[PDB]
């Protein structure tokens, strides 16, 4: 069984069937006793559980991690954290819409 | 004495392509994706998800790359392990190398790897999208030309009249042949 | 789950007294500065500026008992003893990779069990004397009645945390234990307590497993007429299978019988008591009697521990049919340099150098 | 001044051409002495046994580096030669240290060309795969094909590439 | 489709040769021996000396081979390591493979290994000696034809009318160009 | 009678030719139905549901093995095919087993030719590097070039080859 | 129902001891060393030098143990042959067992075999040296009482009050009888 | 310095007895019959059924003894193998030896074997039945003494005044303990 | 394995497989390596492998019966001589064994 | 004459005692010089250099053999010693062979006792397990306890023992 | 041919009569293509030829092997290789010296 | 530092400087208790030890191993033992003669 690929989604549009999630956004503040922090995307706030590295307040970063579903709520096990504050986001969102509105039909044509 | 250029792909197109293994010694292995694109050397931009695994005797070194569309095992053999010494888990990378097979899974025999800014990741997205759509429409145009006659001198002449490159005809022929 | 956007507004209303419209205007001021923040994120930022954002708001090992929520598990500890990893068979028939570690603080000690893939993740990087931060883990009761820590997938282990409780842990050198008494075999009599003996395992007498109370850790009597196990300390209890081992120690001046109970014998043999249970059962299925099957099991398969030196400690008693036996409170492998020093001082007393 | 041109359309004699591509191979690294002020090769004439620049007179030469590598941009493969201080900027290391490295490699018993290629392969293998913009003039060699002599180099831009690919998509008819 | 034939060789002549690594896609890396013979695939007969070291992850295999004149490290990578499972210490094998360079030490990348009988050993020795004698005679014949005249159109005419193959002369010329 | 000839001198149309060499590759292995009496191909008719041999009428099909490999003797390379009994004699496994293997590959979700190739390269890879002498005739294929259809094969007779090498050494000018 | 303690010995003492074979079924065989010490069970520490030898019907199993002064044979018969599969060549083992004699050579019958750490080896050296020194001291003390008094009740009392153990006296007497 | 006399037995009794393995160094192994008899040394008279097999290295020698009641494997280790060379197939011999149980099957360790005459075999049946009747009657007359009182002073006093050896009481106690 | 069984010519039973007999050879035949025994009550056909007894002496044979359609044959494996011996005492001790032994083991318990 | 007795009831000081049993173990085999008339060991005098027999004057000594072994009857174990020609008949080997063999033992660097033990256990082991009737007297030794000195030995008489068994069986109460 | 015990000696004290020697030290330099390694015990450097396995560099090891004496140099034909990476060498050398300066005299006392 | 391959030499022409040699001969006597066997090629006899296996007596064998030189004797420690029962020795000797007769002059050909 090959590893499943990451899927980029937003907090307000997180789906139930997903397992691995890449999330881009700003951290608002961090609790260090738990190695955890609160990440804001522009549409919601999520709990991100750091393992060894802790971010700083006010930088736009991208985190790939695993989701865990329980009675407690939605807490995200971070795996890899990367800096993005020195980057663009408008073109990223634009290509996201274009990518989503083009993929469904691309493989539809061309039989075999 | 020529070297064919590297083509930019989504990883998923690499995983379920059709691998043609060379027979003679004067032609290389290659890959034919679903939409009839001839790929020799791949070039991808993406993240690394796991710590590199290199043997103690620097014989072989392999790790993983994910573009958000699949998982690919990037390998480097013998004296290529130096490349695998340039990567630490948790950084964007740009990779270029050949394509080969093992245990029914696509693997990239590494030839170069580098660290790169996100803006180039966006550039990779745009470039691969435009190239894919271009090849889709060109192949769609060539489809009926192949279907109506196949590989005939008149078919080649008329395909040249529409300005369709010669290769696509035999690419489609080999794809149809491997259909059976 | 993070507090909802409306919940934060309610908290700010209570903690400050501003109206909802005023808070909404202050929120509207925020994304003008940063349009990439959410409405909930804007409220959180406003609370942080106001000083309210601390809504989410020293634990030792002694107060921990089985049944805690893993979210409340937050303790530190320095490595006391490190055990080699072992192998265990999972419920599905697959074989798992199990390791145990010993850590302590100034408040007590606990036994932690590391499971499955995590051993490769943390066991290799961890060494004796290191400090471990524990979060989101499960607490289980041991056969000795002390809490045990089970590191599952949800559990996490951190190396060298930045916690204030790290400095208050005493070092390994300062760790103090009981004294007991070092003594030769040939000059001990019945009733002598707190005696330690170092030597070689020369014979394997018996291995057994039987049911016992899971609370006071002692044998439970099964009532044939009632069909349950009655503990005359806790009433009816569910039995748990624990093992005893009877072997013989040799030193060069004598030879004595030693009895090991429960967990220590489990570590020495390296097999969970359940396997002893079905092996004893399937020997019984061959028509052999209980004691004969026990001796057979002791002889045919567990013969590989003869000839390994140990250092046991406990209390000696006398039986009219067996002679002198030693009930072992605990055992520990050797330490060498200490024994070398003893041999050197004995040579000095001999007057050779 | 400088005209963009895809590699597939490059032919001999093209002047003032700049390309965008990827370093896909490193061939050779070397260095030598030249006239410091006009950056031209000086002749160590043995009749006088001196370094002469026969356009400025007698001068004291200084070291400068030459790099030979290969570039690929998804359409065709070209070779690039980079001159002097531009190579120093690209590699970030002084020419002098390159010089003593070449000396200590060649003293082992290796030919100058072989030592240069060994130096290029075993020490500058971490620069391949990156994205570059080359800028120069194309020359033809009988036994090497087409070679681009770089007058200057600069890293790739992002917003210009984005707008160009956007307008290309507009020409395509996707929006 | 053309697979060029495999030539039988002493291990010492393989270990002494000059290695030329191809640059283009349609050219193979080859080895020109001391007496101007061009080898792509090598086929030797020798005694296994040490136990094959097989990776636990089933990635690479390797073992040494001796035949009375030298010892060489036969390798196998990726899916080829299965070959390095077919032999053990003391066996007397025949090995066919390519030629590779690593750390200034030549190696044979295996494409076939199989056990044989001592009569094969004797016949291999006769065959390699005879083939070496023939080629060295031909090289002796061609050396003066090359050096006295050079590469000229009439030189090829002389070579063909005396029975000298054309490829020998540019092999010799490349050999000299290397050795200067 | 068969005539021994070097592989270089093999041209389409020659008959009764024998070649010595080594197995350098394995191309295909499979089995198919044939008449149980003349050992010739039979045609299964879907409309009739029976096997027809246009020499014996309806017969019970039997499995015969088809093997395609490559032979090299130091001067060339030729594709060699083996039919029926000799093929599984060389492989050493009963043809019904090959039929079962190719079938079990078929229900895995794979088509016939690639299943045959996988069987050839995954379980019969130990026949590479074995000295073989074959006898047969050469036939030209417009798709594959020269092909040697081996009637039968046998192990090498050492003494005759040793004598041949001795004669060639005597002729060459040493003995 | 008693079992005598095992002693720690050098191999050069087992090789040069005297083997007394009991005749009654109620007393076991024993060995008196050169310096008047009686040994029932030996306990050595040594390194295996050859591969364990196992019977095909596994009626016996044996191997060789060396510590630094001599090489001795570990045997196991019938049921005990399982022990001969617990060790491999190149290990540092500790062997507790009995003493057996066969063709004027002394051999050990295994009763327990176990791997140990090098620190065990060092401890073994120190402890055996100390025991040997103490026994030599006691032996030279008791020897002159034996020679100048003899085996008398008053002599035994004087040995008791002079710090000499009782049975050592007839140990000396038995050694003197055997050497005669 | 005592030796217990041997006893003559039926083969089935040895096969279907209870092997008590002493663990002290001052008590040997023994065998308890169903009818509460202690046997130390077996002594049987019968015919060999199979030719002797001996290890080539002269380590162990065993064969099969039969009298019509059972077949038993008589063994000799090390130097006792010479006994296995004294007997040929088909003869009627007498064997005397010890008792030791292997793989849940009784065995006779050889100590002496000799050729004999059948008239002694009739004498053997006579003597074994004569011993059997006396010992079974003794067990019968001691069973009530055992089970009426047990291990008490009065019990053994009245038993010895009756004419029964005291040790039979302990034998019965041991057998009953083995029962449960 | 199966313990050796001794029986008698006229009372030999089908259930027996390996049997011991005692008798006198009356005549032989070398082509089949076979011969005949009489114990005073019947004739027994004994098929030897390679050894041959003589006529007129008392001997014992350990063999196995071959219950086939070809007749009566005993696959003998062992022969031993008793010309010097007696047999009335053997018969009387056998009778004592039969009339005593099966009663003895039934006596006493555990 | 000689009285039948059982080992269990054997007591020291008894003479003319005849017992039956089997040989279980052989202790010692020796040969030494004795007078040819009274069959008594002669005393060799160093000052005289001759073997004086102080009942017949000076005589020429002759070899005579002594045997020590052990006997079991099912009721006890007794060491027994046999003199001279009775041992010759029992063992069947003339005394000069014993003398040669023992000497052969002692040139190897062996003194008398262990050499005799080795010879007994190395070439005279086949005689244990054979039924023997002994006639002699009981003697007591300070270390070896009871020892039967056999004046003579005879083979077992089967019929008399059979009838003795029958009559004791009748007295038991069977018939 | 009775088997001789493995005499243990230090590198600089290697005698010409020595046949089978055990050397304890560390590997400062190893070679995998020749499968040969050098021991540095402090007093000197020695050449050891292995057969199937090699140790690493700097880890304390013990080796038992036969002597290869020739004009080329002094090489030791290894057969047994064990690891001593965690042993107290000081105690070992102390007990070696103590054993050497005791035992020859100890056999001297007592007679027969 | 390339390893010296197994030089093929005759027993009667064993040279001092050799370190690894290979022989082809017949075993004449075997002592399994000591793992010894005697190799006689017709020009002399040599002793060869063993690791774990010994061949039976009477068949042609080939042994590759290292020479152990000491005061006890000159014997070869076997490493690899192969069976040449069916081999033809005459042709092998003939090619050996042809080889050392031809090869030294053969390399003299060709200039630079
Ligand atoms: Zn309780
Ligand atoms: Zn200038
Ligand atoms: Zn047909
Ligand atoms: Zn006299």
Numbering used by the authors:
A (entry chain F), K (entry chain C), L (entry chain I): 6 to 117
B (entry chain E), E (entry chain H), G (entry chain B), H (entry chain K): 2 to 181
C (entry chain A): 2 to 58, 63 to 358
D (entry chain D), F (entry chain G), J (entry chain J): 184 to 358
I (entry chain L): 8 to 117
From the paper:
Unexpectedly, aside from forming nucleoprotein filaments in the presence of ssDNA, we discovered that PabRPA oligomerizes in solution to form higher-order assemblies in the absence of ssDNA. The PabRPA tetrameric supercomplex is formed by two dimers (AB and CD) arranged in a C2-symmetrical assembly, which interact through contacts involving their Tri-Cs. Interactions within the AB and CD dimers involve their OB-3 domains, while the two dimers are held together by interactions involving their OB-4 domains. An interaction between AROD and OB-4 was also observed by Cryo-EM.
Replication Protein A (RPA) is a heterotrimeric single stranded DNA-binding protein with essential roles in DNA replication, recombination and repair. In Archaea, the same function is also fulfilled by a heterotrimeric RPA. We report three crystal structures and five cryo-EM structures of Pyrococcus abyssi RPA (hereafter referred to PabRPA), in its apo form as well as bound to ssDNA. We find that archaeal and eukaryotic RPAs share a conserved heterotrimerization core, which is composed of three OB domains connected through a three-helix bundle formed by a C-terminal α-helix from each subunit.
